[PDB]
Amino acid sequence: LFGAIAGFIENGWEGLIDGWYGFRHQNAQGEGTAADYKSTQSAIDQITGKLNRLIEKTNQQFELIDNEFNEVEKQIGNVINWTRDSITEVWSYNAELLVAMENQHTIDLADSEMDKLYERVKRQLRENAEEDGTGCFEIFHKCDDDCMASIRNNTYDHSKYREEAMQN
């Protein structure tokens, strides 16, 4: 667990119907919420990869060894039942562990996509801003909706707006 989703981020954005991860800023020119494709998609393409593994085919045919209309001889009957139940326990165990294991990893890799997004944006901004600590970034140079869209698409200049925010 990477400590982000249900970590230092106390809630989730139910207003975000556009994707899995996104940015919500607050400058002067009003307000707006967005969405992040490359973070949303990479996590989506990984969960999708899990179902494609789960759903699988077998050319492994199985036949009858029992008879429902005419009960087989008891001795062989019980050996067959005993064996079938033994295998049933194995598959019930396997199925439970698989899902538990997969779910644990699914959640963690999703939380590991939040932190992976975060820290890279934190790297774009250099010393031109500082970590608020609760998933937010406190800037000391006012950025606009033309400049905000330049951070969303990884084009913000990590220096050509720095010296101004340095004094502050």
């Binding site: 989730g12 139910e14 996104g22 919500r24 789960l54 009858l64 008879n67």
Partner: protein
């Protein structure tokens, strides 16, 4: 600037390695519970035996007259099915069934047994056709007159084929020691049978059994498989139901037992008695004895796989 993640009003509780009942954004089912109550048989050559029993298709009671040479990818046995007109049963009957289920059908062939100094047209009112008849692939051998002896005959048949030949014979067990003689004359009757693989022998056992189909006598049905170029010989002296034709396995098939209708509208590969399991899911909680190409049976009714992240509301 602030970043975050999506969330929903009502999420889905799943279970993890460490938790139980943790809500996620979205989840999918892993265990199949939806059954279709018909035999999905689209694209397959199907044979519904109905009243005919699987073992009947070899001996040929009236029910199985239309199944003496069937051919199938899929074979369906029915509860009303029956291997028998004149009361009796098969020794090693379930092994024989499992053989026939995956046989892809059967092909019959005359063995060509000829009979001198005996009778041949033994029949019964348990096997009705025009009137009293008998098994179509068998022959009720008998003494010439309404009593007298039965010559120690000996018939033989060589499998000239490339495939194993299903041979089947029958031992008649008369109601009494009186009835046994009236049919085959007095004395200890002995039917011996051998091959380059098989080794056995049979004695009748007269005596009163309860009436089934109206009869107190029984017919033991026995069988062996004849390998290519191997020969089988029937040393007998009475109380003996002779094989008329042998059988050969056509190819490959699957056999199921069911009580639901056939549906050529849907395609199945995993079957059970209550219908067809069509699913891509790895597991199922429907029938532990389902056969064919099936998901694994599990005890659990439901196992939800998380297809989303943690779900936390404000």
């Amino acid at each position: 600037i602030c970043l975050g993640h999506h969330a929903v009003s009502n999420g889905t509780k799943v279970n993890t390695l460490t938790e139980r009942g943790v809500e996620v954004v979205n989840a999918t089912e892993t265990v199949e519970r939806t059954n279709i109550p018909r035999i999905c048989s689209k694209g397959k050559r199907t044979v519904d035996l109905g009243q005919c029993g699987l073992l009947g298709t070899i001996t040929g009671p009236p029910q199985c007259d239309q199944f003496l040479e069937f051919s199938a990818d899929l074979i369906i046995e029915r509860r009303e099915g029956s291997d028998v007109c004149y009361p009796g049963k098969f020794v090693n009957e379930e092994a024989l069934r499992q053989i026939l289920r995956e046989s892809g059908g059967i092909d019959k062939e005359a063995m060509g047994f000829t009979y001198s100094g005996i009778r041949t047209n033994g029949a019964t009112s348990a096997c009705r056709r025009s009137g009293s008849s008998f098994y179509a692939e068998m022959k009720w051998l008998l003494s010439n007159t309404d009593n007298a002896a039965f010559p120690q005959m000996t018939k033989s048949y060589k499998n000239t084929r490339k495939s194993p030949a299903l041979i089947v014979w029958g031992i008649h067990h008369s109601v009494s020691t009186a009835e046994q003689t009236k049919l085959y004359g007095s004395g200890n009757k002995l039917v011996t049978v051998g091959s380059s693989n098989y080794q056995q022998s049979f004695v009748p056992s007269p005596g009163a059994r309860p009436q089934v189909n109206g009869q107190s006598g029984r017919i033991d049905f026995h069988w062996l498989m004849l390998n290519p170029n191997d020969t089988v010989t029937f040393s007998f002296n009475g109380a003996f139901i002779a094989p008329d034709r042998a059988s050969f396995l056509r190819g490959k098939s699957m056999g199921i037992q069911s009580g639901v209708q056939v549906d050529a509208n849907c395609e199945g590969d995993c079957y059970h008695s209550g219908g067809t399991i069509i699913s891509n899911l790895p597991f199922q909680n429907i029938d532990s004895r389902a056969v064919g190409k099936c998901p694994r049976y599990v005890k659990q009714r439901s196992l939800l796989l998380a297809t989303g992240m943690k779900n936390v509301p404000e």
